[PDB]
């Protein structure tokens, strides 16, 4: 039988580890374990950059992952990158595929994508070269393997790709802490399942640290972004400038990228090189060479169209990542494309089967799938319990609704268009998650919860499994990963 995911207790004075299912806690020291952990989490990120909430929700009891789990995650990722990259590069250039009619975006967004296609490859790369930061989330279900036993299966529920940093600094800080504490890598039979240097170095590849960095953020409060800015300040002497949409300016310029100078207002002008400043129309400006985006889709839509094109030439993530890869419907498009992706030699046959096992069944609005769904549920009302309704741009379970209201919702999804200024739903099969023995808080309360996983990609490269959750922002306990030393 394959080694399962499990949470370990690890003695901080000697390193002896034991599964939580089995550990007799009669003489545990959870409170002092918690304080040691929280001190250590201040190493890469000061109290300035942390939310005290999030630093306190961390658990010194890591999740044990196996080398099979790692091979599984890396393989799913390789197939995912290949499929989604091919789809994105084909979005408007393979018209017979009808992608914008199968997954409609807002019209000013589809205008933006079409402008971007006109810039490739001389002003913007082909998409394979600028995929940026993606962070998929996965759930864990059971599957009858051949192996004649139960094996853990990972289903990607969503790809987080409009922001570039969320999750990255938590994994970096947490893996570095349990290492500094000796939980792993210190001779007790455990090693860290993710290298924090690998993760952080991926982030550093999103931008050139030689040039000044701007971070454009509006209504979003931010979490990992402030931990990165803390680490850059204290360890590298890099100080990115946060700017808001209203701070942006354009100046006419022949000899410049896209015939304009993208600028922003400067709030702290005394601390700047006076030779970097422009006094224009009552504004004190500095120029923007590279900008990281932490904006909502509506905020992006609210930019003046020329302002929006000038951001696209200078921004990470690329607008194709933010608008296409982040959208939950793209998981539906990948499933539609599997047979076509093997016909084009984009996926091997087994890679298509890996993807089909790694993405839950997803029905898109305006699809024939959604039509046969409505028919199948009219002939089998018990079916609605097996599915859910996730929003794109608040999940809704079919077992929590009457059959009359369920066919109603589905009947309203027969067009693929988006509600003006809003979105739509996808219909996804409910994943039956495994339950795990866990001790998440220093209270010592053993419970039996599911595990929510995530992993980190930069420019298509798998960087490591991310933190385990059982959202950290809404209070959730979290931890990181170890492997047997064998
Ligand atoms: N396909 C799915 N089946 C069941 N729950 C889901 C699914 N997609 C998202 N979720 C919910 O969203 C959370 C993670 O986004 C899960 O823990 C679960 O509550």
Numbering used by the authors: 5 to 149, 151 to 398, 404 to 480, 487 to 502
Quote the study that presented this structure, word for word.
Therefore, the first amide bond between (2S,3S)-t-ES and l-Ile is catalyzed by Cp1B, while formation of the second amide bond between 14 and putrescine is catalyzed by Cp1D. Cp1B is also enantiospecific for (2S,3S)-t-ES and steady-state kinetics showed that Cp1B phosphorylated (2S,3S)-t-ES with kcat/KM (apparent) of 48.0 mM−1 min−1. The X-ray crystal structure of Cp1B complexed with adenosine and 2-morpholinoethanesulfonic acid (MES) was determined to 2.7-Å resolution. The ATP-binding site in Cp1B where adenosine resides is partially covered by the lid domain with the P-loop and the A-loop from domain A52, indicating that the Cp1B structure is in the closed form. This unexpected closed form without a substrate or product could result from the binding of the buffer MES molecule in the active site. The morpholine moiety of MES is found to be housed in the hydrophobic pocket with F175, V228, V477 and I488. Docking simulation of (2S,3S)-t-ES-l-Phe with Cp1B showed that the side chain of l-Phe can also be housed in the same hydrophobic pocket, suggesting that the MES-binding site could be where the side chain of the l-amino acid binds. Similar to the ATP-binding site of hGSH synthetases, the adenosine in the Cp1B structure is sandwiched between the strands of two antiparallel β-sheets and is surrounded by the conserved residues R139, D141, E163 and N165, which are likely involved in generation of the acyl-phosphate intermediate. Individual substitutions of each residue to alanine either abolished or significantly attenuated enzymatic activity of Cp1B. Hence, although annotated as a HP, our biochemical and structural characterization demonstrated that Cp1B is the biochemically validated example of an ATP-grasp enzyme in fungal natural product biosynthesis.
E-64 is an irreversible cysteine protease inhibitor prominently used in chemical biology and drug discovery. Here we uncover a nonribosomal peptide synthetase-independent biosynthetic pathway for E-64, which is widely conserved in fungi. The pathway starts with epoxidation of fumaric acid to the warhead (2S,3S)-trans-epoxysuccinic acid with an Fe(II)/α-ketoglutarate-dependent oxygenase, followed by successive condensation with an l-amino acid by an adenosine triphosphate grasp enzyme and with an amine by the fungal example of amide bond synthetase. Both amide bond-forming enzymes display notable biocatalytic potential, including scalability, stereoselectivity toward the warhead and broader substrate scopes in forming the amide bonds.
